[PDB]
Amino acid sequence: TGSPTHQREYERFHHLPGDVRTRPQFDFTFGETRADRVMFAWRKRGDLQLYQMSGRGETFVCYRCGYPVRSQLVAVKADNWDYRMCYRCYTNTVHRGMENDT
Amino acid sequence: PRHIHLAAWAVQEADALKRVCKIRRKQVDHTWEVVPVGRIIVNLMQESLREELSLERKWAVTKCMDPLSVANAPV
Amino acid sequence: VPQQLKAYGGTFSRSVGERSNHLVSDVVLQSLSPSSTHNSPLLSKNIKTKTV
């Protein structure tokens, strides 16, 4: 709904519940542009960590739902990017308390 | 090789006055070391290699620079 | 030469309500999947499964 000077990118997904409504712990925008394009990273909610990228969307497959998901929010398990997880199942896992048991 | 290296170092020290640089401290060739001293050059070898390559014989037998020597067919 | 673009060469079945719409009831069974049960006039209303 505005330029970054008025609305930070992580605030775009403010209609969804979960950690996305909390300010990310790490910002990688001012320094440089990371190859993967991840611009924000949230505090590890267990072995899972949430990242947001400045791209139209990376079509990955989450190992919980199993569906291909196209979004900027990606949850990775124990820093292993080979196992991505979409924000819906990330939020459900955090709510159920299965952060370290998926 | 140790004797060769020691002799080369001694020659370089004797030339120390006008010497500009030293020889390598790690002997590349363990049977032949050459110390260049301006127009003079000293070659220290072992007996086997000296007999193999007879530079002394070649340079003693080679004829002087005759200007007419260039008046021959090409090769 | 005849045609060089196809989406599905084969033909589908005329049946709509079930796999065996044409067959008579006394020759084929009726699918008990919930999708068929939903339209079924008997299997949708009441079904008892709890046991003593």
């Binding site: - | - | 030469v1 045609q3 060089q4 673009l5 196809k6 989406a7 599905y8 060469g9 084969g10 033909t11 589908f12």
Partner: protein
């Protein structure tokens, strides 16, 4: 999705209009190729050779 599943056995599940364009292009190419082949087989000229 298919065009008309009830008539897939007739039109390959593709709109005839799209099929019409595809066949127009392919028939143009095939006619050019056939003319070239006739010229080659008859001596560079179809009617004359």
């Amino acid at each position: 999705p298919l065009f008309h599943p009830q008539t897939t056995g007739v039109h390959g599940g593709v709109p005839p209009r799209q099929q019409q364009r595809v066949m127009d292009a392919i028939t143009w190419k095939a006619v050019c190729f056939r003319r070239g082949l006739l010229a080659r087989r008859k001596g560079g000229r179809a009617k004359f050779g």
